[PDB]
Amino acid sequence: MATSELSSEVSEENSERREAFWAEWKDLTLSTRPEEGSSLHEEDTQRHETYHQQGQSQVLVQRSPWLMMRMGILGRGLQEYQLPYQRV
Amino acid sequence: TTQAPTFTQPLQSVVVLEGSTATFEAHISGFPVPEVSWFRDGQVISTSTLPGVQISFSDGRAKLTIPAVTKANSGRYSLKATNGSGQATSTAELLVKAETAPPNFVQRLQSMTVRQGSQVRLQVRVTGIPTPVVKFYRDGAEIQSSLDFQISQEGDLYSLLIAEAYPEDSGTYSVNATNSVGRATSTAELLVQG
Amino acid sequence: MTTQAPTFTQPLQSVVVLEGSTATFEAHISGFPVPEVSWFRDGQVISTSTLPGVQISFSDGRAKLTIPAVTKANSGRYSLKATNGSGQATSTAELLVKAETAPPNFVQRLQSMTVRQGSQVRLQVRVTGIPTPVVKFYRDGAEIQSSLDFQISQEGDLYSLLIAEAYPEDSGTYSVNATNSVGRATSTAELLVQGET
């Protein structure tokens, strides 16, 4: 329904050297898929019975300046990738 | 070299299920070691405003634990580190979701062929959060509980008791269960022999 | 031994993955006789002619479809259909393919420095991001257009601003700002050019 957008911020300063540093970024975005997105449906023509179910699933994608992403469906586990993404 | 506080790993957002444990964690470097303090929505954090919180800061590793979070706990969380050279703030969000689940039929309707004049009992078992709204239907028309067609609820077990079945009662019966995050449907066929 | 229509012991589950990595839909199935099994994308039947490299398997009641290297274009709904003489069963889940992105970061920060009138001075940063961040230099709040006067130049991911010869008028607060579609960052430092003594 409504995508959520979470932001993280960092603000550091050094008065001994007069140096500062800022940062703000789209840290975590949480989205909502429509139930039609993951459904199940079964027909038994021998016993004349049918079953149907559908449900929303919320996806979670996270990121960071330190080059590392995180993603998954909320309820299932998250997966962690190493940006500049390679292969094994 | 006195070294102003700095983050090698700042706070990062956290999403988590109502009732679970949420955890903010960050690594801080500096010298002399900073005085760290945590905030929520601008107000300082304490056992008083967040019952059961746990805090720790050893070996460059800062960590704040909230035991049994509740929706009301959502908001911006800050960590501040200072010392003679300077300071540092790292800010992140905590969003808590309701633990929800689409309607599920643990026991589904079942087709049955019976004898005219029989008592027939069709029953399902349904779970959901939020509680599903459950209704019964015959051939697309919603059934209205009554003495001849008795619908009753017992825990998460729903029942339709047809006192006296006849051939006019034959057809496709179905039960629909809906809630804010989904819906499920179980249909079966009832044959009444004359 | 017991003619039983096909039923998903465990439905398909939607998945989010990183463009370039492997994706797998998995399901467990029952029935007898054992169901014929087949897969679809957005209603269209799946074959090695529609999805080169796909690995499909179906044995021991467990059906698997794996895409070794997913692309953005693979996003869609995936259906596993199981058929047999007593009935039929379907399961649909989504595949969501996300691209690599990372907000600007300063792997090496601007650094305050004191120098002597007439020194060559180099202010340099090392910036990382995906997509590649746009980077700018500023002095006392105003942006610097690279020029003879202040030569800005990039060398790999390392950006630097050379002051051919430094003078007091050059003392001031410098800063670099890095932005892209997912975040921004700023590193500020100070430069002090010593006077005559």
Q: B71: helix, coil or strand?
A: helix
Strands in A1-48 per DSSP E: 4-14, 19-44
CATH level 3 topology of C99-197: Immunoglobulin-like (2.60.40)
d(CA B81, CA B181): 42
Q: How far apart are CA C96 and CA A73, in angstroms?
A: 10
Q: Are B8 and B28 within 8 A, CB to CB?
A: yes
Radius of gyration of chain C (CA): 30
B16: distance to nearest CA of chain A, Å? 9
Q: In what order do the strands lie in the sheet with B61-66?
A: B3-9, B22-31, B61-66, B54-58
CA of residue B138 relative to chain centroid, distance: 32
Q: What are φ and ψ of residue C132, in 5° steps? A: -55, 125
Q: What is the CATH number of the domain that holds A66?
A: 2.20.160.10
Residues B96, C179, B5, B57, Cα dihedral to 10°? 20
Question: Considering only residues 80 to 109 of chain C, which have any Cβ-Cβ distance to chain A shorter than 8 Å?
Answer: 86-94, 96, 98, 100-106, 109
Domain count, chain A: 1
Q: Which two tokens stand for residue C156?
A: 């790999």
Residue keyed to tokens 């049994």: B68
Q: Collapse the DSSP code of B58 into the 3-class scheme (helix H, G, I; strand E, B; otherwise coil) and give the result.
A: strand
Q: What are phi and psi of C161, to 5 degrees?
A: -125, 110
Asked if A67's CB is within 8 angstroms of C128's CB, the reply is: yes
The residues in B 31-90 lying below 8 A from A, measured between CB atoms, are: 84-90
**Alpha-carbon distance C146 to nearest alpha carbon in chain A (angstroms):** 23
3-state secondary structure of C72: helix
Q: Work out the number of other CB atoms within 10 angstroms of the CB of residue C61.
A: 13
B98-194 falls under which CATH superfamily?
A: Immunoglobulins (2.60.40.10)
- Tokens representing C6 are 């096909």
Take residue B103 and report the two structure tokens written for it.
């309607």
Q: Is A58 on the interface with B (CB under 8 A)?
A: yes
CATH T-level assignment (fold) for domain B1-97 = Immunoglobulin-like (2.60.40)
Determine the 3-state secondary structure of C118 from DSSP: coil
> What is the location of CATH 2.60.40.10 in chain C?
1-98, 99-197
CB A4 within 8 Å of CB B83 = no
In this structure, whether the domain defined by C1-98 belongs to CATH 2.60.40.10 is answered with yes
Helix (H, G, I), strand (E, B) or coil at B116: coil
Intervals of CATH 2.60.40.10 along chain B: 1-97, 98-194
Which of C6, C100, C109 lies at the smallest CB-CB distance from A83? C100
Experimentally determined by: X-ray
Containing structural domain, residue A50: 1-84
Nearest to B2 among A9, A16, A27 (CB): A16
Who among A11, A50, A53 is closest to B187 (CB)?
Answer: A50
SS3 category, B167: helix
Task: Give residue for tokens 């035991």.
Answer: B67
CB–CB of A74/A60 below 8 Å? yes
Residue A54: name the closest of A37, A72, A78 by CA: A37
Sorted by sequence, the CB contacts under 8 Å of residue B10 that are 6+ apart come out as A8, A10, B26, B90, B92
Report d(CA A53, CA B186) in Å as an integer.
9
Q: How far is CA C110 from CA B174, C6, C71, C143, C188, in A?
A: 70, 65, 38, 16, 6
Cα angle C155, C157, C162; round to 5: 50
The C-alpha atoms of residue C183 and residue C130 are separated, in whole angstroms, by 10
Residues 6+ apart with CB under 8 A from C104: A23, A65, C127, C128, C129, C133, C178, C179, C180, C183, C184, C185
Resolution for this PDB entry, in angstroms: 2.8
Peptide bond preceding A34 in cis form (omega within 30 of 0): no
Task: Mutate one of B1, B3, B9, B13 to test the A interface: name it (highest A CB count within 10 A).
Answer: B13
* Helices and strands per DSSP (H, E), number in chain B: 0, 18
d(CA C162, CA B177): 70
